[PDB]
Amino acid sequence: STGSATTTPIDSLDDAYITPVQIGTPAQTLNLDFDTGSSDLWVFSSETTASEVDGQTIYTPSKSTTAKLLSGATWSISYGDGSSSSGDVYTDTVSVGGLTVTGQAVESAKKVSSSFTEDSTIDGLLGLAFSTLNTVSPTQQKTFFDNAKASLDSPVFTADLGYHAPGTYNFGFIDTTAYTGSITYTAVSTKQGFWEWTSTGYAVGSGTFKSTSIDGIADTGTTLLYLPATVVSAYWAQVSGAKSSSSVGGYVFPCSATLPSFTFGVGSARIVIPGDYIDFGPISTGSSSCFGGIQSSAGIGINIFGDVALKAAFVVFNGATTPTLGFASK
Numbered sequence: 001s002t003g004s005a006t007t008t009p010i011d012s013l014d015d016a017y018i019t020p021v022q023i024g025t026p027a028q029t030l031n032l033d034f035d036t037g038s039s040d041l042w043v044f045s046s047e048t049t050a051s052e053v054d055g056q057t058i059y060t061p062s063k064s065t066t067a068k069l070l071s072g073a074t075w076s077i078s079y080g081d082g083s084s085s086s087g088d089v090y091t092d093t094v095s096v097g098g099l100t101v102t103g104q105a106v107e108s109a110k111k112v113s114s115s116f117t118e119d120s121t122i123d124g125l126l127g128l129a130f131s132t133l134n135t136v137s138p139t140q141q142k143t144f145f146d147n148a149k150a151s152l153d154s155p156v157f158t159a160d161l162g163y164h165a166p167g168t169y170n171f172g173f174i175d176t177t178a179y180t181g182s183i184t185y186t187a188v189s190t191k192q193g194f195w196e197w198t199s200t201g202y203a204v205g206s207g208t209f210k211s212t213s214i215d216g217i218a219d220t221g222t223t224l225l226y227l228p229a230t231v232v233s234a235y236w237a238q239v240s241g242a243k244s245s246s247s248v249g250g251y252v253f254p255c256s257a258t259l260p261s262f263t264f265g266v267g268s269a270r271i272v273i274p275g276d277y278i279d280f281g282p283i284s285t286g287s288s289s290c291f292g293g294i295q296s297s298a299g300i301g302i303n304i305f306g307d308v309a310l311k312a313a314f315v316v317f318n319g320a321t322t323p324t325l326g327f328a329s330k
């Protein structure tokens with residue numbers, strides 16, 4: 001079997017992407033943020049504290065004939081920004097773009113952090129990292145992808161994120177019309193539960209390629225590109241007037257500047273991020289200072305190839321027994 005679903009940016013900056021997901025019987029459609037950096041499927045629900053819900057569509061297990069309470073199971077997650085949520089667990093039928101999994105763990109939020117409440121367009125997260133990171137206790141649960149793996153034609157999913165435009169998540173097949181050239185595959189380490197890989201180097205604009213190993217994770221759930229301080233300094237040094245700002249929390253640049261492209265290596269292949277993808281607009285309404293899409297990972301502890309990088313490529317998440325990541329130009 002296969003599935004295919006359109007994913008849509010939530011705002012004009014591509015801060016995140018939402019994908020419609022059908023939960024329950026009859027279907028309740030929620031717009032979820034597909035996150036290859038986490039492994040929980042959690043949703044706003046009828047159980048969420050009413051004061052913490054502002055315009056989200058909620059999952060109502062009592063209206064689903066296939067929902068079953070997973071007795072005694074709880075979950076609690078905290079993300080890399082101090083985002084957190086927690087609650088109890090149901091099992092229910094979950095379908096993505098025609099692909100159906102029965103008995104999927106659906107984690108119902110009783111409390112969510114304020115950053116989720118203020119984001120009316122995201123009804124929950126669908127985690128696509130490895131199941132070892134799932135937070136359900138005492139019995140850890142499988143991700144949607146792990147549950148679907150057996151039924152899939154091929155144990156893969158692909159991410160084709162658009163620049164200021166809709167894109168596609170496909171499950172079980174590789175659309176050979178969606179990319180150009182060849183797909184370059186690279187080894188994945190699962191030791192931390194992430195889609196972790198090693199980039200072979202980088203270039204700034206038309207500069208010479210610097211061969212150097214950058215270990216990082218492919219994370220559709222993170223907006224920006226977070227790289228070591230040395231790399232990020234070399235990039236912003238080519239932008240007249242750019243500086244690292246303590247009060248803003250990262251590199252900013254004059255909105256009038258034109259940004260150079262950024263190239264990262266995948267084996268012997270090169271993926272080019274156009275400079276326009278790195279512009280995240282004014283730091284505040286009316287400001288002439290703009291926020292950069294490439295930032296330092298020094299405070300995070302891990303390098304993150306977020307949406308800024310991934311949307312420049314067609315990306316294959318190969319969940320075979322030896323997992324690999326594939327990158328192609330598009």
Ligand SMILES: NCc1ccc(C(F)(F)F)cc1
Nearest residue numbers: 037038079080219221222302
């Ligand atoms: N998109 C989920 C996510 C968020 C933050 C982190 C890290 F890097 F902070 F641990 C990993 C994964």
